[PDB]
Amino acid sequence: ATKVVCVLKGDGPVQGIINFEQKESNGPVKVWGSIKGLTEGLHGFHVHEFGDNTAGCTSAGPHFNPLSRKHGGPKDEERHVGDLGNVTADKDGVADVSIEDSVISLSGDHCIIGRTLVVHEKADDLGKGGNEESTKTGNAGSRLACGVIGIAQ
Amino acid sequence: ATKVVCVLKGDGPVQGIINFEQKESNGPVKVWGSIKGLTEGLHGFHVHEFGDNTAGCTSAGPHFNPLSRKHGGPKDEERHVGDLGNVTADKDGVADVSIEDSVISLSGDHCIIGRTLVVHEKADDLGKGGNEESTKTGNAGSRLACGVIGIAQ
Ligand SMILES: O=C(Nc1ccccc1)c1ccccc1[SeH]
Ligand SMILES: O=C(Nc1ccccc1)c1ccccc1[SeH]
Ligand SMILES: [Zn+2]
Ligand SMILES: [Zn+2]
């Protein structure tokens, strides 16, 4: 019943449209849409803390982390609320996105409305890279495109 | 205290940053920042319903209007929640924005988080233009720049 949407833009050629939908407050969020202009393979896919694009995607701050946990894959107990893991771009540079997540929400204290969705330069190592940056960002590199997560029709 | 922010971008040169601060729930909201690339004079300045940028500023929908009223100035009893009236571009094309509104909120029913701020091509006539368009849009014309209203540090 709660419908939200995010348009991903950055300096470069990466852009996309991601829909979010949640039927029950406590229940899962379906995340789906398309992203084009990516390099083929995995790209880190995260909700960042701030709906702030004042200095581009950098202003968005870290992965949304209300419970002060270390970075992980979406399936781990130890993760950021914003840890949606990876999306996969085909050879034409298009990632078809379809995720269900039960840690993000479109209501309550884990609500992601007014926060930033970011698609990253390279693979999220899901906290398994064996360095400090692995358990903070997943070493997914720079922020290619982002947008503020907003209420849709 | 809640702090939110909006970056205004469009197809032309209008660019700006607008901060929103509310110290207590259903308290007044301070709106302040800077917009540049505006023609000298009054520009309609409204929160629109949808934080949806899929089709540029057009997909923002109409003025945020949860109480199903007609368009007016921010000081009118008959207004949209999104009716913030006008901002003034000086002779350099810069609008230094500073508004206090008690109808918009950053919590509860009148909350503008995940909605869209739009600066318009022309003056908001505050519903006194003597036509249908006046009682819906204030004849503010086209959407020069918009942004989704997001959570700030
Ligand atoms: O809904 C929100 N909070 C909220 C907090 C506690 C209980 C119920 C609801 C919210 C606040 C800001 C932005 C977006 C949302 Se969804
Ligand atoms: O505030 C929100 N929910 C909410 C829930 C319970 C009490 C008060 C408020 C909210 C939801 C979506 C967007 C923005 C806000 Se501010
Ligand atoms: Zn993380
Ligand atoms: Zn209006």
Numbering used by the authors:
A (entry chain A), B (entry chain C): 1 to 153
From the paper:
Moreover, we demonstrate that ebselen and a number of its analogues form a covalent bond with Cys111 of A4V SOD1 using x-ray crystallography. In this study, we successfully co-crystallised A4V SOD1 on wild-type background (no C6S mutation) with various compounds in C2 space group and provide direct visualisation of the binding of ebselen, compounds 1, 4 and 6 at Cys111. The binding poses of ebselen, compounds 1 and 6 observed in A4V SOD1 structures are similar in that the seleno-head group covalently binds at Cys111 and the aromatic tail extends into the surrounding solvent beyond the dimer groove. Water-bridging hydrogen bonds were observed in A4V-ebselen and A4V-compound 1 structures, indirectly connecting carbonyl group or aromatic ring of the ligands with Gly108 backbone or Asp109 side chain. The phenyl ring of ebselen also links with the peptide backbone of Gly108 and Asp109 through an amide-π interaction, which is also observed in our previous crystal structure of wild-type SOD1 conjugated with ebselen. Although the covalent bond is the main interaction connecting the ligand and the protein, two ligands facing each other at the dimer interface are primarily linked by π-π stacking at aromatic rings. This stacking interaction might play an important role in stabilising the dimer. Conversely, A4VC6S-ebselen shows a strong band equivalent to disulphide reduced and unmodified SOD1 thus indicating Cys111 is extensively protected by ebselen binding. The crystal structures of ligand-bound A4V mutant and wild-type SOD113 agree with the thermal shift study that the compounds form a covalent bond with the sulphur atom of Cys111 of each monomer and the aromatic rings are in the position which promotes face-to-face π–π stacking interaction.
